[PDB]
Design an enzyme around this catalytic site. Sequence first.
Site: not given
Ligand code: ADP
Ligand code: MG
Lengths: 77, 107, 190, 538, 93, 317, 53, 528
Positions: H61, H94-95, H391
């Site tokens: 996170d 958040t990232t 989350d």
């Molecule tokens: N199965 C998946 N395939 C492709 N992209 C994904 C998948 N799951 C999540 N994502 C992408 O990864 C990103 C999520 O970032 P993450 O670090 O997981 O959480 P945060 O939202 O805090 O950044 C988003 O852009 C989401 O669209």
């Molecule tokens: Mg996320």
Amino acid sequence: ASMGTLAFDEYGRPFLIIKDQDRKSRLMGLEALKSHIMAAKAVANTMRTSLGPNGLDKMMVDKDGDVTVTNDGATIL
Amino acid sequence: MAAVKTLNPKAEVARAQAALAVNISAARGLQDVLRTNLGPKGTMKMLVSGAGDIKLTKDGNVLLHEMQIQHPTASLIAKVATAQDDITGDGTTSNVLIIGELLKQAD
Amino acid sequence: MQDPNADTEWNDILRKKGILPPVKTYEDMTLEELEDHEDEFNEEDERAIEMYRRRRLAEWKATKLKNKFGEVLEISGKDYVQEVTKAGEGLWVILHLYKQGIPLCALINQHLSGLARKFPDVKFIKAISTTCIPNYPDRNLPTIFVYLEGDIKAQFIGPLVFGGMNLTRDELEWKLSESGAIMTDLEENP
Amino acid sequence: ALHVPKAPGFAQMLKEGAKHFSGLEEAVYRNIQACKELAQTTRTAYGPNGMNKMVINHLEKLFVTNDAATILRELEVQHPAAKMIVMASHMQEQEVGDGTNFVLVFAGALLELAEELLRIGLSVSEVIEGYEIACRKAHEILPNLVCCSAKNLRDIDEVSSLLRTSIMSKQYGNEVFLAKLIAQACVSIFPDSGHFNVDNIRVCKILGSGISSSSVLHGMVFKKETEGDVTSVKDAKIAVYSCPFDGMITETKGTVLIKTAEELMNFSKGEENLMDAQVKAIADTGANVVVTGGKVADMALHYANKYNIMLVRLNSKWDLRRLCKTVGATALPRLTPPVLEEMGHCDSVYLSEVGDTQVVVFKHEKEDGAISTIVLRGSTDNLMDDIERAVDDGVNTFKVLTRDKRLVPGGGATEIELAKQITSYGETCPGLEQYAIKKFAEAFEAIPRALAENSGVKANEVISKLYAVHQEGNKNVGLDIEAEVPAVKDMLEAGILDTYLGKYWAIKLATNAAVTVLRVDQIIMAKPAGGPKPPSGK
Amino acid sequence: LVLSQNTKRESGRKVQSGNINAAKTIADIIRTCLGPKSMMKMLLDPMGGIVMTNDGNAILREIQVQHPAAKSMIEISRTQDEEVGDGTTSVII
Amino acid sequence: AALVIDNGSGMCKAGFAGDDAPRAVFPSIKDSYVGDEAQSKRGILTLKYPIEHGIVTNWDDMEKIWHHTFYNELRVAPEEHPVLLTEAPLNPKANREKMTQIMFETFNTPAMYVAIQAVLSLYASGRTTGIVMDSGDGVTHTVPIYEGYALPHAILRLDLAGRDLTDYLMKITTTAEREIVRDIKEKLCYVALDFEQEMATALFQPSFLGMESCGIHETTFNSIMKCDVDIRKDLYANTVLSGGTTMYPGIADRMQKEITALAPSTMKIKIIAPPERKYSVWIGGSILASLSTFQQMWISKQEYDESGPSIVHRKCF
Amino acid sequence: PLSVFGDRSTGETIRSQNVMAAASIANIVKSSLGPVGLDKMLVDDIGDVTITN
Amino acid sequence: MMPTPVILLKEGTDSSQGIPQLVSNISACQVIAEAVRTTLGPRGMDKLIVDGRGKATISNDGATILKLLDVVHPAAKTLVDIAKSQDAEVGDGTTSVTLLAAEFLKQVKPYVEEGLHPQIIIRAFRTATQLAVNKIKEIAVTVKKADKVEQRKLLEKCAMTALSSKLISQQKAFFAKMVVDAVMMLDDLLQLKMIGIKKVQGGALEDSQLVAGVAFKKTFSYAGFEMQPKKYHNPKIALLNVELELKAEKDNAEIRVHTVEDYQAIVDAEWNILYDKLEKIHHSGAKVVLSKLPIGDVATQYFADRDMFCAGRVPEEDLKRTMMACGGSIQTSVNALSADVLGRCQVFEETQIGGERYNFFTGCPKAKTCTFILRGGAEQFMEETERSLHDAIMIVRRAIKNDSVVAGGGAIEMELSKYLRDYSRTIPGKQQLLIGAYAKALEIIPRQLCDNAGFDATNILNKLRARHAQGGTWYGVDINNEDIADNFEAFVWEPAMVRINALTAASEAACLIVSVDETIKNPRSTVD
Ligand SMILES: Nc1ncnc2c1ncn2[C@@H]1O[C@H](COP(=O)(O)OP(=O)(O)O)[C@@H](O)[C@H]1O
Ligand SMILES: [Mg+2]
Ligand SMILES: Nc1ncnc2c1ncn2[C@@H]1O[C@H](COP(=O)(O)OP(=O)(O)O)[C@@H](O)[C@H]1O
Ligand SMILES: Nc1ncnc2c1ncn2[C@@H]1O[C@H](COP(=O)(O)OP(=O)(O)O)[C@@H](O)[C@H]1O
Ligand SMILES: Nc1ncnc2c1ncn2[C@@H]1O[C@H](COP(=O)(O)OP(=O)(O)O)[C@@H](O)[C@H]1O
Ligand SMILES: [Mg+2]
């Protein structure tokens, strides 16, 4: 590969980002994974000789000098 | 504290009234020491070196160079007296007294 | 301390309570230097200058008496014991163990030939190592021994410790003065 | 002869760490230099193009702002003359609320020009004479430069257009939104009486949704939760108590003196029955919301839940007073049921979650009340603090307009016209005063000069254009921020206006500060103390 | 690190105003030694000597400074003294 | 100079500013000569000490004491020297008005100031900011101090002093034997980081004694948390302990550990409690009276004449 | 694991450092480029001054 | 500069001014971004940070990671602040917020270095942010059918997406069902305090569970608690704020008697007070008793003899959840214990869960509460599991309130980059460069996904730019295929508010950081 960030500035002015950045350490990437694996391998190779009927015991000595002889992995760790 | 101290921080400076005060005070001090040398009824001073050597003197030039003084005005007046002595041999005490008294009467 | 120690009265009170802890003279001028001026000196000074000049003249005559040899000479092993172990009492001896073959040895010998005339008080000798020491190793030259009263005071041994082929007549002089034998007036430049 | 001794007298009797400066060279010019350094420290924040500064104070707290008074407070100004100019700027902030950076710029400029005049051969006394007479001329002139007036402060479009200028210098990118919000808030307040109180505009900073999510609320918001089980109420009948929600106890000392098993058996039941009676009397007055400034007892909370009363606990006394003003209630020092007049009312009282924060909202539906709140959303606490400062500027401008409805042209138009007219006055005054009058006039040029420098254009081209256009007769012309090249335009037709009172007080205070700094001739600083700071200021 | 620890670097309007202020200070040192009604200064050499003068180059020559602009002004005075032998205060002012 | 009378619920410990030690420790401090130089003191020798538990019971007594700590054990006159008196934290306003009426009206002191004993204790240790845990014979106090002044709003007062401490030890009755238990209290009584590992080889927890309010470490933590979040670092890292009660067990590290536990994992807490000068409050008062900011803080005689109990209360009601 | 008696930077770290160093050196001189460039003073820890473009 | 006998500010004031100061701010922000980059996406990694206390925290996170870094740079604190703000308002992204802000700053770094006035840059950022936000609100898919099966599908997919970055992705479908089951029970305010999350060390992630009821750990039982029964099949539950033990009737209470008969009467009176409280509690029909306050050994044994269950020192939150689940009210007095205030469940039990004893109230059909019970092999394992679920839960709440979904894998980022490139090609040419830079910055999300996955981000971004310019709006990174794909059909769904708030917060941070032209550090007071 250690000592947080170290550039201090491309203009010569102080670059302070994290508190005690000079006293702090950091490992990134595959070397971090390899350190983890070595640590885990050391712990596991310590424990594997206490496994099975012919397994041997370990003699743990605490801070105040009391002795504990055991084959129990939870008590050892 | 002034112009010179902004460029050379370890600088000592006496300006206008302060400089006059410094110089006249030193002149008056030399005069106060040497007032007793003047004339036959004057008193002899004893001067002991850092080695312990004794000098009995009533001479203005000898007393000046033997007193233990570190003042720039005193240095100026000592040199004036030294020239007086080198050229005439006498007149050093009176030299110092008249210098000090001119400075006082001008103040 | 709790506050930064600076020009403030609080630190000063704390300090008071007990916290926050808080040409010179003719005496040195040589014979040449004394002649250089002569006139400068006042006659009252010149009276004691006569005594100091007599002192310096006596010292120079003593050194003249002491400068026995002033030149490099070669001794064989057979007489080594007399020339080095039993040299003049208190006389500094410098022995160069060398073979003519090694060129670095010849360079050191030339430098010693110069220093011998430069330092006529010190005794400078040279000798073939195979002829001074039974079976002296080949790769152990030049060997500069510094002796006093038969006792070894220094030993610069090796073709590497001595100071390389760039060794002028200066760094060797300093190395020899390291044990206080030749007493040069300089520092180790190279 | 290798040390200069301290001269006999004051130089020797002076203490060790004390300093003594005397004369134009050691004192006057050094003071002017310090004030110049100050003006330079705060110059780049002047105007809409002014840049923010990130000041970190001795407590490692961060202020990101281009509010001059905030920067000065959070700086550790140690030179006494600069301290005096800052004192003037803070008096400006106190009296008017906006114009501190004008005070700094103008004072620094007057002092620089006074140094120039002292170098050409004028005396501090004559410089002061000329500066004071020129300030009097500026005050005589300013009333004639007034172009617009408010003409209505109960409207929201006119009031928004009026507050836009004050909230543009701060928060330039978004000035229509904030001016709308502050106008809504200001007009909900400002009753039929001509008195307007700025403490009745509350600002609640909640984090996470960008500034465009900010809102106005005719009522109150408290970052609190409810003490009981009830969370919403639609016809609030609030009862406010300065006392805790517990049984009253003795001020001397109380001891339960038991002498019989019966008294012991009955004491606790009597206590709860008493509490039940008290809260039931309160509930039977019709109150559905109780707000206590003290603590809440477990039994009293029990019975408030039983009788469906929403309990709210406000630790602060100012919060309680402001809630009383909001709802029309009276804080009762006893737990007695309220009379029909001591009760307050709200169209809604509810617990909500704005973002991560849980809040209790006392919300009226009417577009009025005694207190209004601005809920500021934002992605950063520092950003929200800067927007709160902008809100404070807008609200203080609204108050200045309630006091004096007159407006002068901004963007340097008033300053250029003042400079021109005071130069024309100094050209008539003979004697050594004319030099100082003309320098006082030219000092006004520092304002459009700073605006031009910060917009990113040549200040000389801008000032020449402004002088030329103001010679042709246009007093409402000032510089254009919306131009990559030096340009100028009608400040009035554009709607960029300042407050007559703002300029009046800024000129008065800046002139007084400069004249005070000049009157100093000797400074006798003492050795710095390690004293536990001023006793009164705590 | 990139540059040495002892390597400082200033830049911009700060440097300009600092150099100009150093020059103005050098000028204020000897501003009063100009003209037929000038006054003398008694400077103290580090050799225990004394120098009483109203000569610009004598004064600026017995002073030592650390700001390079002030160094440049003292070099001005030296240049004027070596070339023409007068004007050592007028040039500085 | 400035007379620094340190009542400190101890003895009078009076003297002058600049002195590293008081010169007038009256309670429990010639003959055959002529005059009244023993009888006048013989009267005071058997007079009960007014301050009990850090609060003045009998004012006539205290006034007679001060008078005998001015004319007899100092042989000076208060009509020309400013006085620095000390008061316990959270001392009633009435006591302040009484002592200010005594000094200005009876002793006619030109100016005086009343300082909190914990603030002066912190001063004697050289610091100006921090939270002082003062535990003496009758009371326990946590005083947060920032910029050298005791924040009057975060003073948490719990009661576990020498008496309350020796109580449970007595439990484990007669005056002499409870004073044997108290002699052990006076002697080594090493604080236990963990009572588990301390009893194995054989105030922090109210249940231990029998109270139900809070530990002293909880008290410090909440007194720090009722202050500014920026000064929180300084409060957490400059906790200074004082009081013979807290000294006897020498409690530093048990506190430190559980306060670290309570606090966020950011501020590093360091407790400085090794001084034991046995005159800390006096030296703090002397430092203050030596400063010039003391002249700044002077409640002057003219101020008193013009305002009365209001000047003693510093207005701001 | 290596046991080398020294420090080791590897990957994006050392590349970023190299670029930072080069940028530092270039920013020293960027202000001295062209008819509008300006000169630099250099003080040699002893008061030896050098003005140059 | 010159010494100046008396200085304006306090000695030690550090002032950094100008373009170098601004570029250094941007570089510090780049550092903060790098510190979280590798956590982005399904191929993201966790970070281990260690405190001064020596306690380690392991997290994917970004908000957590940045809270733990003791960032002190005044400009780099802003990224930490916007990550906090994102965790507050939304709970995910958040990232992404930090990456986007830092990338805006990186993209405008060249223009800043060449003397472009920052006001121009902030104007461009504001414009492009408004445009991209309106475009997200425009192309966001909002199914206007209010069908319940589709509204559960939508939440499950949004939760699976929010969870496809954590150490529970290999059970994320599992956890997603629970998260929905969790938030579909909360009533209307969706209070997080109404979802309990217990962490019982030991067991596997699939051994974790959700209880549609309440559960809490055994609480310091006295003697006789083992004599009590431990299962009830239709209990009525008395929830109290009552101390049940022999105690001083009041702390300021003083008994005074002069007779031994009165003495004994007083003893028996204390006992009768207690026994009367217990008898009222017993006659209310309650077979289970919970008190927010202690229940002494006497009361424990009383209830054990009456074959009732008692638990004291229950935490306040667990009591309020027991209330919302079983359907009663918390009573400080035992004088009116009506069935109106008693609670009720179909089963009460005390069971062993991995070394701990837990009380389960299960079978509450009227339950507005749920309790997660998380298993795992480490304190930090379970803590990061809880953070992941937080989350997912926040995501599901926001989706419930506004079921307006966009696609992920950088699909939305590429679409906005396209839209803003197009827009920038229609404006004078100064703002053109800056809005094109905004567009180029938006590409950091798919680029970082490809990086963390181990692909050639350049080739994939080329494919994406082409496929989004050919017609197609939900094409993004397909990680398991190292390619691109229609992520809206692949069900990589993301509530629109996530990216809306990400862009808003990142643009605000960039504008703030870029508006600062001077930094003035005063010297620390109380140095120590
Ligand atoms: N199965 C998946 N395939 C492709 N992209 C994904 C998948 N799951 C999540 N994502 C992408 O990864 C990103 C999520 O970032 P993450 O670090 O997981 O959480 P945060 O939202 O805090 O950044 C988003 O852009 C989401 O669209
Ligand atoms: Mg996320
Ligand atoms: N017997 C004397 N009676 C009166 N005045 C004398 C007598 N002898 C010398 N003087 C005067 O005293 C003054 C000081 O004498 P002396 O101390 O030798 O001179 P100086 O002060 O230069 O050393 C001279 O001016 C001299 O004329
Ligand atoms: N749109 C605008 N165009 C030109 N000048 C403006 C504009 N908005 C505000 N100003 C000017 O900015 C100055 C005030 O800005 P500010 O930084 O708040 O200083 P102060 O704190 O003194 O009000 C005034 O001179 C005002 O006329
Ligand atoms: N009697 C005078 N009246 C007016 N000006 C004079 C007089 N004498 C000289 N000057 C001028 O004043 C200046 C005095 O120069 P001076 O003080 O010697 O310094 P320098 O000649 O080294 O610059 C010169 O410009 C000279 O022309
Ligand atoms: Mg303004």
